[PDB]
Amino acid sequence: RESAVTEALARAVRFLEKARTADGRWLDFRFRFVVGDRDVISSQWVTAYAGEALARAGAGPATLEPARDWLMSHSHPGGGWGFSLATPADADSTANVVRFLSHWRGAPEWDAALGEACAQLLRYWDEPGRGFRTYRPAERPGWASYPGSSWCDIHLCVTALAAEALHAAGDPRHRPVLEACARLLRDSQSPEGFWEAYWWHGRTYTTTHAARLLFLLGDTGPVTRAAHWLRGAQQPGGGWGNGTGSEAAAFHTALALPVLLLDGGRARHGAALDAGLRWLLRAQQPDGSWAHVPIMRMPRPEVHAPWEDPEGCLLLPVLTDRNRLFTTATVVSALVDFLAAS
Numbered sequence: 001r002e003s004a005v006t007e008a009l010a011r012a013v014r015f016l017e018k019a020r021t022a023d024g025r026w027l028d029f030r031f032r033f034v035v036g037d038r039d040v041i042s043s044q045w046v047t048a049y050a051g052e053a054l055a056r057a058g059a060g061p062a063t064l065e066p067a068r069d070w071l072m073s074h075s076h077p078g079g080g081w082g083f084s085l086a087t088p089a090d091a092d093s094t095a096n097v098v099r100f101l102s103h104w105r106g107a108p109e110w111d112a113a114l115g116e117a118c119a120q121l122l123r124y125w126d127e128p129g130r131g132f133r134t135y136r137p138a139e140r141p142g143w144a145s146y147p148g149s150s151w152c153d154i155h156l157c158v159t160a161l162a163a164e165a166l167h168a169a170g171d172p173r174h175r176p177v178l179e180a181c182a183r184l185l186r187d188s189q190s191p192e193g194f195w196e197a198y199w200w201h202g203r204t205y206t207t208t209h210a211a212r213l214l215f216l217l218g219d220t221g222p223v224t225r226a227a228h229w230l231r232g233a234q235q236p237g238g239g240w241g242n243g244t245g246s247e248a249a250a251f252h253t254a255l256a257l258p259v260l261l262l263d264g265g266r267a268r269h270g271a272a273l274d275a276g277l278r279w280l281l282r283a284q285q286p287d288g289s290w291a292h293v294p295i296m297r298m299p300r301p302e303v304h305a306p307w308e309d310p311e312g313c314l315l316l317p318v319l320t321d322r323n324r325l326f327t328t329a330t331v332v333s334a335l336v337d338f339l340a341a342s
């Protein structure tokens with residue numbers, strides 16, 4: 001029923017609203033890096049991702065504007081955004097900012113800010129490779145984004161989101177970049193129908209973003225293949241895990257459902273969608289959040305294909321969002337997709 005889903009969405013929105021600092025920040029992915037004595041925690045990246053999800057969920061100006069304004073007043077001085085101001089900037093955090101700022105398209109001042117944010121994202125564009133590099137190689141000084149590091153490779157997870165971001169920003173001049181990204185993703189899809197990720201412990205994350213990019217360009221064959229793969233991956237109790245064998249989790253379920261909604265929604269995948277939705281409804285915590293599982297991997301800089309050795313490739317243990325803000329935002333996005341479906 002639309003009602004049970006509307007209620008779950010409202011509870012999740014409230015969870016995220018209450019977690020925001022007064023000055024506009026959502027903080028998550030706290031962890032201890034290999035070098036440096038104290039914890040890092042994501043500000044810019046998480047704030048943009050949460051903000052974008054809340055924008056799609058129809059959160060009001062009181063919720064959204066402080067986060068937008070915080071990002072605008074807390075960009076990296078060299079340009080763009082990153083994990084936090086204490087890290088380098090990166091294409092993925094910058095792409096998330098672009099996608100969030102796209103919600104103010106049509107206001108000339110925001111059109112200008114959006115255009116600037118896109119130009120910052122394009123500093124990570126590699127025309128010969130047809131994709132985006134997460135980190136730009138910096139020759140000098142303990143963050144592992146130095147020349148030849150796999151942290152500065154073209155990454156498919158980032159490429160898909162960056163292309164989605166440029167699509168949302170709406171500038172027709174970016175269409176050749178979009179098309180090139182889409183060609184790389186089309187060429188990189190597994191025969192089974194998933195995509196691998198660099199930064200994500202699983203086959204669900206790239207799949208959601210790549211499928212959606214190809215959907216936006218009207219290239220739906222890859223989408224059908226992805227949805228077919230997800231149909232098989234669905235666990236007996238109706239949730240999805242990571243697509244490399246893990247048990248059902250909220251994050252992965254929220255990544256799977258949108259792809260089915262792009263491949264005929266209830267007219268083709270009704271039973272699978274209903275089971276995934278019920279899984280999310282039963283799993284929601286009293287506070288309106290969903291429980292985290294380990295989702296974000298940081299590979300050793302010498303490892304270029306972490307997907308071939310998920311457990312063995314790691315610089316540090318696979319990261320979760322201990323505040324549940326990234327996981328919950330992902331679920332919010334999926335519920336919005338549901339409520340939009342016939």
Ligand SMILES: [Cl-]
Nearest residue numbers: 043084085086
């Ligand atoms: Cl910061």
